[PDB]
């Protein structure tokens, strides 16, 4: 029950003990592996608090200390009285960094300890949320020299007073359904582009309209806000070889800022915790541009390359996919916006794995998500066995607000 | 219990009921997923229920469940077991068995073809020379002058585990690999260890970059013997590129017949330790893995160089670019020579259709996403977006230890 993992490219074997700390459940059994599935009170709360504080106080080398026991007592009393508890700033920052550290699907985790945590637990209104969010966006963007950040809004109370960012990311392009049949802009956000409009948003109906923020405070009706255009760093996409590439009329935003997840720390639930780092190239060029249910521009590109698009056997899609991804990187690098290629990021992750096994006893990792969506086996992670398990603190999926919101 | 899988590109949902028939274990638990881990003498005690489960399946398939033919067969197997401590499959059962082991192979993307398998019954074989003969005929039939035909040859089942039949090669056709004293490797690095064994057994190695390895064959638990496959039976394809004319000068070729020979076939508790099987290649097996894995021929750099690519920074995607051209070349050469091959877009698309058809008619299709998704261009193939359930059904193909690690030497 002390498990080993092998890298088949290098024969390096690591031994995992960290998994024995794990608490939550995978969805798998002895009889069935669900590794490729996308999604899996007072008495409940105190053991959850205890586990977290034990982790926290061990990490600062004061396990079994006055301070530790005192803090344990104080939280215990606050729970019994208030039916919840409040985290100290130091605990909050610790919890946030470890939620990222524990994200088994994140390839970018080597950077986990350098996260800028913004405490937004004093926020009361959507206008406040907006202000906190603009500050996040401007700080994280940093004129192209990106910095990882998370902004944490007040924690859940009774599920009727939830703070929520309705957007899936702070910055995303609209998608509008055309009468001619297809789809203009980003098909992923068609339902959301609608709700914004269904709420008052005047859509320029372009291919790349930055969506408004739809912010929800204390459980009230969400409100639209337009992010100041000068806070939205965008990169026009050109190819370092194909001069016709620019005419495609493509651009993307610099800041990937996921806003729909739930942060769990010591039993406490933060339903609104937008976080951001910087892009791996393939996220945009492979998935965003080339997924069928997204921008799906592959055909257009191959056409302009004049490739034999007659038989799949010519691998025109593969050839085009590469060039597109070359362009994304080139463009971002040219405009001095932080981006990482999949080779660099996966090599970084192997090292990070090494570090975590060495200093922590393991590193939970979801191979299905860690291996990039192109050129899989020529990246070192493909040949790396990984053990997937759920540690806490964590980022969790949560239901879409518009299915839950008691209007 | 019913389980649902979702294709996130088409929103198509399928319902699995077949996972209930699952017997073996996955390696996973409620607290840990081992989905990316590469690897996961029987007694009369535990043998009859395994026979029975298989015979129940077999007789259901032919719609004679509960028939007198069914009941008598069960009886016959039972007496034979408790009398002889094992049993013999009928030809019909053996053929069904082999096909279903392939059908159940969760890591195999080519399973649309499962019902079209040529089963060669080699259970009357007694010596390595006889093995060589059966294997020669397999290769000849399977190759069919480039028009490949799926086939499997099944040698006698295990008895006491002391008289095992084994093919010591990992595949029937594979290239030698030679560790040089300077640390560099000549030929296929994957085959270095096996190559050394062959040489030690008396193989006279030509020491080239593409030497077809001899067959090393063990019958009835005796020491293995060397055999050279007749070269006119080994179909090979020179690799060239449809636009790059220097590509031929790399000196590359590959063999046309992928024929895996080191797995164990399990049918109704019986273990067939020698059961070589073959289909035809998906292009990326050769082009991505065989040529471009760092631990294999590893030709990305030389190809990148001849392409004059920006090789100073990985963000130029010179590795990605070279990889695609090599795979174009592999596919081109095979089609040009009329040797059966399938590209990864075609194969994955076929798999989705197969999988849907299997859910509908069988109640499921066990699949290992980690292996099903191609090693290049993952998300632009439809399997990437397909949720899959992995579980182990029998009959099945299983890993087994390398024979040089377990073999008791006679001399
Ligand atoms: C700093 C550079 C970062 C890089 C290069 C990076 C990279 C990635 C990539 C490529 C994915 C797969 C995304 C997809 O396919 O949709 C991912 C997933 C994820 N990332 Fe990171 N990331 C970074 C920073 C962060 C930060 C700061 C956090 C949180 C504070 C984070 C948390 C996560 C989580 C929770 C997932 C999985 C979400 C899910 O389960 O769907 N990442 N990351
Ligand atoms: C006819 C054309 C076939 C194609 C195109 C095909 C395709 C593939 C591919 C690409 C793999 C992954 C191999 C790797 O990456 O190492 C695989 C795995 C596998 N195939 Fe098929 N296959 C075919 C026929 C067959 C046949 C005839 C059998 C047996 C009768 C079979 C049984 C298996 C098994 C057991 C695995 C898993 C190997 C493992 O677990 O290590 N396949 N297949
Ligand atoms: C449509 N994809 C599924 C998905 C769902 C959810 C949710 N809920 C979050 C997701 O987040 C992906 C993610 C998260 C954090 C990131 C940080 C940096 C970065 N470059 N990409 C990053 C990507 C993805
Ligand atoms: C070292 N690579 C991992 C591996 C291990 C073993 C074993 N034991 C078998 C393997 O078989 C892969 C396989 C099996 C059957 C195939 C049939 C056709 C085909 N084109 N490829 C096919 C590939 C692979
Ligand atoms: C560690 C990992 O499971 C291992 O490298 C696997 C990944 N997926 C694979 N998929 C296929 N088809 N063939 C392989 O050899 C592998 N290797
Ligand atoms: C079906 C499968 O679970 C789904 O397509 C997953 C596969 N792997 C992925 N990997 C990453 N990094 N991101 C994804 O969205 C997905 N999608
Ligand atoms: Zn699992």
XYZ file of C-alpha atoms in Angstrom, chain A residues 27-399:
373
model
C -15.252 7.461 -8.460
C -13.289 4.281 -9.296
C -13.636 0.828 -7.745
C -11.793 -2.513 -7.786
C -14.154 -3.396 -10.618
C -14.179 -0.240 -12.727
C -11.862 2.642 -13.544
C -13.510 5.999 -14.147
C -10.262 7.800 -14.955
C -11.664 9.296 -18.174
C -14.899 10.623 -16.704
C -14.957 14.465 -16.808
C -16.767 14.852 -13.460
C -16.505 12.151 -10.695
C -23.314 20.674 9.671
C -21.532 21.317 12.993
C -20.496 17.696 13.550
C -19.292 17.511 9.924
C -17.236 20.680 10.171
C -14.860 20.296 13.152
C -12.968 17.208 11.973
C -12.505 19.024 8.677
C -11.141 22.076 10.518
C -8.917 19.861 12.682
C -7.373 18.053 9.726
C -6.527 21.360 8.054
C -5.074 23.003 11.162
C -3.004 19.881 11.800
C -1.598 20.187 8.251
C -1.045 23.921 8.711
C 0.717 23.663 12.054
C 2.877 20.770 10.851
C 3.972 22.853 7.826
C 5.330 25.624 10.089
C 6.995 23.151 12.474
C 4.704 23.845 15.421
C 2.830 20.555 15.417
C 1.651 19.771 18.925
C 2.290 23.304 20.175
C 0.498 25.659 22.540
C -0.394 27.785 19.512
C -1.653 24.700 17.665
C -3.759 23.361 20.558
C -4.938 26.918 21.348
C -6.041 27.531 17.764
C -7.723 24.119 17.699
C -9.646 25.075 20.834
C -10.613 28.522 19.530
C -11.965 27.144 16.247
C -13.735 24.325 18.094
C -15.508 26.873 20.311
C -16.290 29.192 17.418
C -17.833 26.281 15.490
C -20.069 25.128 18.375
C -21.274 28.693 18.894
C -21.443 30.168 15.380
C -21.954 26.923 13.363
C -18.950 27.917 11.240
C -15.529 29.552 11.668
C -13.233 32.132 10.097
C -9.745 31.436 8.763
C -6.752 33.505 9.832
C -5.075 35.277 6.896
C -2.035 32.997 7.166
C -4.293 29.909 7.010
C -6.203 31.368 4.071
C -3.033 31.932 2.043
C -1.801 28.456 3.010
C -5.104 26.881 2.015
C -5.217 28.596 -1.375
C -1.669 27.631 -2.324
C -2.325 24.021 -1.314
C -5.584 23.824 -3.236
C -3.445 24.609 -6.316
C -0.663 22.285 -5.126
C -3.270 19.533 -4.825
C -4.872 20.090 -8.258
C -4.087 16.717 -9.874
C -5.131 17.967 -13.305
C -2.858 21.003 -13.334
C 0.380 20.761 -15.296
C 1.532 24.196 -14.114
C 1.903 23.274 -10.461
C 5.677 23.827 -10.190
C 4.748 27.477 -9.526
C 2.308 26.691 -6.708
C 4.026 28.484 -3.822
C 4.242 31.794 -5.708
C 0.532 32.582 -5.732
C -0.678 36.060 -4.873
C -3.736 35.661 -2.647
C -6.238 38.551 -2.471
C -8.538 38.464 0.537
C -11.912 39.732 -0.590
C -13.916 38.427 2.364
C -14.995 41.982 3.293
C -16.879 42.333 -0.001
C -20.673 42.812 0.168
C -21.929 43.813 -3.302
C -21.479 43.034 -6.995
C -19.953 46.473 -7.494
C -17.425 45.488 -4.841
C -16.826 42.175 -6.608
C -16.222 44.070 -9.855
C -13.660 46.333 -8.202
C -11.854 43.414 -6.619
C -11.944 41.653 -9.985
C -10.560 44.611 -11.949
C -7.741 44.816 -9.412
C -7.031 41.098 -9.869
C -7.038 41.426 -13.654
C -4.688 44.411 -13.660
C -2.295 42.872 -11.128
C -2.216 39.417 -12.789
C -1.745 40.889 -16.260
C 1.128 43.191 -15.295
C 1.493 44.594 -18.835
C 2.200 41.112 -20.173
C 4.517 39.842 -17.451
C 1.867 37.613 -15.899
C 1.653 36.764 -12.205
C -0.473 34.028 -10.645
C -3.294 35.321 -8.427
C -6.500 34.251 -6.698
C -9.197 36.510 -5.278
C -11.286 34.988 -2.506
C -14.817 36.228 -1.805
C -16.837 35.516 1.392
C -17.310 31.816 2.232
C -20.680 30.036 2.026
C -23.024 30.452 4.996
C -26.344 28.680 4.376
C -26.246 28.271 0.587
C -28.810 31.050 0.177
C -26.177 33.776 0.518
C -23.605 32.533 -2.006
C -21.167 34.754 -3.843
C -20.755 33.543 -7.439
C -18.998 34.661 -10.606
C -21.367 33.431 -13.336
C -18.707 33.616 -16.037
C -16.598 30.467 -16.536
C -13.536 32.685 -16.977
C -13.132 36.418 -16.206
C -12.199 36.982 -19.836
C -13.939 35.071 -22.639
C -15.254 35.745 -26.150
C -18.990 35.830 -26.957
C -20.715 33.250 -29.139
C -23.929 33.976 -31.002
C -26.114 31.505 -32.889
C -26.698 32.581 -36.507
C -30.000 31.974 -38.321
C -28.015 30.487 -41.211
C -27.370 27.543 -38.905
C -23.827 27.720 -37.554
C -22.181 29.891 -34.912
C -20.302 33.204 -34.751
C -17.623 33.742 -32.101
C -17.068 31.083 -29.436
C -19.641 28.214 -29.450
C -18.726 27.256 -25.842
C -20.235 30.430 -24.468
C -23.382 30.523 -26.609
C -25.648 29.789 -23.632
C -23.800 32.392 -21.537
C -23.603 34.987 -24.333
C -27.389 34.587 -24.372
C -27.953 35.051 -20.620
C -25.879 38.252 -20.702
C -28.063 39.528 -23.532
C -31.096 38.060 -21.735
C -30.003 40.399 -18.946
C -29.364 43.585 -20.919
C -25.951 43.241 -22.547
C -25.642 45.011 -25.891
C -23.711 42.524 -28.008
C -21.526 43.995 -30.790
C -22.032 40.552 -32.387
C -18.436 40.241 -33.516
C -16.207 37.180 -33.688
C -14.253 38.254 -30.596
C -16.399 40.348 -28.236
C -15.070 40.316 -24.656
C -17.962 39.123 -22.475
C -19.268 41.304 -19.595
C -18.917 40.163 -15.988
C -22.063 38.738 -14.361
C -21.408 39.033 -10.643
C -23.491 37.665 -7.763
C -23.108 38.854 -4.154
C -24.872 37.503 -1.042
C -27.246 35.514 -3.233
C -28.818 38.515 -4.952
C -29.544 38.814 -8.681
C -26.306 39.025 -10.704
C -25.237 42.267 -12.391
C -23.461 43.040 -15.666
C -20.176 44.945 -15.710
C -17.850 45.773 -18.587
C -14.176 45.139 -17.872
C -12.169 48.238 -18.838
C -10.793 47.371 -22.299
C -7.362 48.626 -21.270
C -7.248 45.923 -18.568
C -7.833 43.215 -21.180
C -4.495 42.264 -22.723
C -5.017 40.698 -26.150
C -2.601 39.213 -28.699
C -3.242 39.412 -32.444
C -2.299 36.066 -33.973
C 0.244 35.969 -36.820
C 2.600 33.301 -38.194
C 6.386 33.805 -38.387
C 6.249 32.347 -41.924
C 2.751 32.568 -43.407
C 1.986 36.234 -44.086
C -1.612 35.362 -44.987
C -2.068 34.143 -41.379
C -2.844 37.643 -40.071
C -5.802 37.947 -42.481
C -7.549 35.042 -40.733
C -8.656 37.707 -38.247
C -7.734 35.843 -35.070
C -6.636 37.088 -31.641
C -6.723 35.751 -28.103
C -6.608 37.141 -24.575
C -3.487 36.927 -22.430
C -5.131 36.036 -19.118
C -6.693 32.638 -18.408
C -8.675 33.278 -15.278
C -10.967 30.476 -14.206
C -13.890 31.778 -12.196
C -16.481 28.988 -11.829
C -14.753 26.638 -9.368
C -15.278 26.222 -5.619
C -12.369 26.428 -3.171
C -12.555 24.161 -0.125
C -10.360 24.794 2.922
C -10.836 23.104 6.296
C -14.478 22.376 5.564
C -15.168 25.977 4.517
C -16.586 26.625 1.017
C -15.564 29.601 -1.152
C -18.025 29.551 -4.081
C -16.333 32.582 -5.631
C -12.593 32.388 -5.982
C -11.431 33.446 -9.452
C -7.833 32.405 -10.136
C -5.399 32.923 -12.961
C -1.921 32.050 -14.119
C -0.764 32.094 -17.733
C -1.413 29.961 -20.838
C 0.172 26.830 -22.147
C 0.088 27.334 -25.923
C -2.014 24.269 -26.735
C -4.959 25.432 -24.608
C -5.589 28.148 -27.175
C -4.247 26.709 -30.452
C -5.272 23.067 -30.060
C -8.432 23.210 -27.956
C -9.798 26.778 -28.311
C -9.021 27.155 -32.065
C -9.216 23.564 -33.324
C -11.782 21.655 -31.234
C -14.837 20.879 -33.367
C -17.290 22.368 -30.839
C -15.183 25.543 -30.591
C -13.534 27.785 -33.235
C -12.954 24.802 -35.532
C -10.772 26.754 -37.964
C -8.670 23.775 -39.056
C -10.261 23.575 -42.512
C -9.783 27.301 -43.206
C -6.104 27.082 -42.278
C -5.287 23.932 -44.281
C -7.075 25.490 -47.275
C -4.787 28.513 -47.137
C -1.821 26.156 -46.799
C -3.207 24.372 -49.912
C -2.936 20.868 -48.439
C -4.556 17.731 -49.867
C -7.623 17.805 -47.639
C -9.029 14.895 -49.642
C -7.982 11.917 -47.514
C -7.374 11.963 -43.753
C -4.238 9.966 -44.603
C -2.375 13.116 -45.722
C -2.430 14.296 -42.066
C -3.321 17.857 -43.197
C -5.103 18.421 -39.882
C -1.981 17.469 -37.962
C 0.187 19.674 -40.185
C -2.169 22.620 -39.801
C -2.594 22.024 -36.064
C 1.184 22.363 -35.636
C 1.464 25.639 -37.614
C -1.399 27.172 -35.653
C 0.344 26.296 -32.421
C 3.638 27.677 -33.715
C 1.806 30.972 -34.428
C 0.202 31.244 -30.948
C 3.556 30.925 -29.223
C 5.266 33.239 -31.752
C 2.578 35.885 -31.333
C 2.588 35.827 -27.546
C 6.372 35.781 -27.381
C 6.583 38.627 -29.917
C 4.242 40.833 -27.851
C 6.035 39.886 -24.618
C 3.089 38.131 -23.053
C 3.954 35.192 -20.807
C 3.182 31.830 -22.417
C 4.680 28.350 -22.098
C 4.949 25.625 -24.787
C 3.818 22.075 -23.947
C 7.356 20.710 -24.028
C 8.575 23.252 -21.492
C 5.543 22.916 -19.205
C 5.633 19.105 -19.164
C 9.381 19.035 -18.536
C 8.745 21.483 -15.676
C 6.056 19.198 -14.287
C 8.382 16.142 -14.332
C 10.849 18.130 -12.221
C 7.973 19.281 -9.970
C 6.903 15.645 -9.580
C 10.490 14.781 -8.597
C 10.448 17.657 -6.058
C 7.094 16.658 -4.527
C 7.981 12.970 -4.241
C 11.249 14.033 -2.664
C 9.898 16.625 -0.203
C 6.262 15.555 0.332
C 6.119 11.844 -0.487
C 4.051 12.168 -3.636
C 2.133 14.299 -6.109
C -1.437 13.540 -7.177
C -1.668 13.628 -10.979
C -4.373 12.941 -13.565
C -2.559 11.594 -16.670
C -5.651 12.133 -18.837
C -5.445 15.892 -18.173
C -1.665 16.238 -17.768
C -0.736 14.872 -21.224
C -1.158 17.751 -23.753
C -3.817 17.508 -26.508
C -1.118 17.271 -29.194
C 2.192 15.470 -29.664
C 1.539 13.467 -26.505
C 4.267 10.832 -26.601
C 7.097 13.208 -27.478
C 6.519 14.972 -24.153
C 8.014 13.297 -21.058
C 4.709 13.118 -19.127
C 3.271 10.534 -21.586
C 5.760 7.944 -20.337
C 5.213 8.865 -16.676
C 2.940 6.686 -14.558
C 0.802 8.929 -12.313
C -1.360 8.220 -9.287
C -4.594 10.171 -9.061
C -6.167 10.859 -5.679
C -8.004 13.724 -3.986
C -6.255 15.815 -1.320
C -7.688 18.803 0.535
C -7.628 21.852 0.418
C -8.962 21.645 -3.146
C -10.687 23.294 -6.065
C -13.938 21.549 -6.896
C -16.488 21.696 -9.681
C -19.795 23.307 -8.659
C -23.200 23.572 -10.422
